[PDB]
Amino acid sequence: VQPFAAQVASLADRYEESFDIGAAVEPHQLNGRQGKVLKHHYNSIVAENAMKPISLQPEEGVFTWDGADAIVEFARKNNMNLRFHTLVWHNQVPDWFFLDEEGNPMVEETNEAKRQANKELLLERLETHIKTVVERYKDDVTAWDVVNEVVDDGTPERGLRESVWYQITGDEYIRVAFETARKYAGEDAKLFINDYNTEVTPKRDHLYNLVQDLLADGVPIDGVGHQAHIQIDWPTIDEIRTSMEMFAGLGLDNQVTELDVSLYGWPPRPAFPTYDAIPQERFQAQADRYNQLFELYEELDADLSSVTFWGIADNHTWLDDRAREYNDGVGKDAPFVFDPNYRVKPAFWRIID
Ligand SMILES: [Mg+2]
Ligand code: NA
């Protein structure tokens, strides 16, 4: 019988001299023993979904603040830091951004000069969206994911992701997003570029050259968010260390923003059907990995300000959707230090020590 997580020592207190300890949350997870476990173990939170562009501005000029407000309210109640995820992304972003005035998709425009019109129109919509979102939460947010996932995985030229944003504006939306965010959040606000697989080449190198570029042009960036959607055996600790040291070497702060330690490889196949189908030895392999990982975080704590998990406990993780995707609709992952009943797992004991 592993104990309920309210009966164990605080992760946040354990790491207070090194970095914040954060969780992604939905608004329905903010009371009960969920809320109690949150208050006790975390001193930072982020919205898993409620602050994404489609959750905030689903139609032009139409802002839906209720979910994000609840999260903002919760962090304030419990004296927690707050990350904003995210001002710019290529998913969970409303379609109206990318349509011209006649209502046709900007990406299908073949007239080069009409494409320049579409560049300017889109950038002003971006600017307006950031301006409005940032105004409301400027006093509460402690770190902004200004752009998310703007670097691509392969292509060893520049390696920028050719989402709709890039197809329409090239790299200019990245510049505008950071410059707008600075103007409205304040000179002290901490502006992040956030991404997954930052640990491995060439993606690592593409992200490095992109932030190097933006810093060269006076674009205000303060840190790199490492999503750290990682596995048990990959990437190596030295790849993680090299990655964070490399971005620190550009005068950037590092944050670990979306940490989950999947029980599977990539792709996550074959998968366990239920949580209680998972053998105990996998939980011990996950704990071993967590230990090495947090020993590295502590080692790098001069350049690492916050470590946020992409969830609370194993009852709710986006990795189930990925497991289900590659295993014919059936599959459970288990990436956290707390299990589906909010009981501690072996990994908890290995990072609380
Ligand atoms: Mg340990
Ligand atoms: Na630190």
Domains of the chain: 1-353 (3.20.20.80)
- Count Cα neighbours of 184 within 13 Å in the Cβ-side half-sphere: 22
Dist. CA 228 → ligand 2 center (Å): 17
Dist. CA 44 → ligand 2 center (Å): 14
- 299 DSSP 8-state letter: H
Dist. CA 3 → ligand 1 center (Å): 19
CB 89 within 8 A of CB 149: yes
**Residues less than 5 Å from ion ligand 2, measured at CB:** 19, 301, 305
- Count Cα neighbours of 295 within 13 Å in the Cβ-side half-sphere: 11
Dist. CA 276 → ligand 2 center (Å): 36
CA dihedral for 128, 131, 136, 137, sign (positive or negative): positive
How far apart CA 6 and CA 172 sit, in angstroms, is 47
Dist. CA 305 → ligand 2 center (Å): 4
Both tokens of 192, joined, read 């992040």
Burial per residue of 27-38, b for 16 or more beta-carbon CB atoms within 10 angstroms, e otherwise:
bebbeeebeebb
Dist. CA 297 → ligand 1 center (Å): 11
- Ligand approaching nearest to the C-alpha of 337: 1
How far apart CA 255 and CA 308 sit, in angstroms, is 8
- Ligand approaching nearest to the C-alpha of 303: 2
How far apart CA 124 and CA 276 sit, in angstroms, is 51
The amino acid occupying position 268 is P
- Ligand approaching nearest to the C-alpha of 20: 2
How far apart CA 345 and CA 85 sit, in angstroms, is 28
How far apart CA 149 and CA 144 sit, in angstroms, is 14
Both tokens of 153, joined, read 């995985």
Cα distances (angstroms) measured from residue 321 to each of 9, 24, 274, 326, 335: 31, 16, 13, 9, 13
The amino acid occupying position 237 is I
Can you tell me whether residue 306 is helix, strand or coil? strand
- 313 DSSP 8-state letter: S
How far apart CA 54 and CA 308 sit, in angstroms, is 23
Which residues define the annotated binding site? 18, 291, 301, 304, 350, 353
CB 212 within 8 A of CB 224: no
How far apart CA 334 and CA 274 sit, in angstroms, is 10
Cα distances (angstroms) measured from residue 310 to each of 61, 95, 246, 335: 30, 26, 24, 9
Dist. CA 337 → ligand 1 center (Å): 12
CB 54 within 8 A of CB 93: yes
Residues 6+ apart with CB under 8 A from 302: none
Task: Provide DSSP, 323-345.
Answer: HHHTTTT--B---SSB-TTSBB-
CB 307 within 8 A of CB 22: yes
Which residues define the annotated binding site for Mg(2+)? 18, 291, 301, 304, 350, 353
Both tokens of 157, joined, read 């030229």
Dist. CA 83 → ligand 2 center (Å): 16
CB 166 within 8 A of CB 104: no
Dist. CA 32 → ligand 1 center (Å): 29
- Ligand approaching nearest to the C-alpha of 255: 2
Q: Which residues are catalytic?
A: 258
CB 144 within 8 A of CB 185: yes
- Ligand approaching nearest to the C-alpha of 307: 2
Nearest to 8 by CA among 285, 348, 333: 348
Method of determination? X-ray
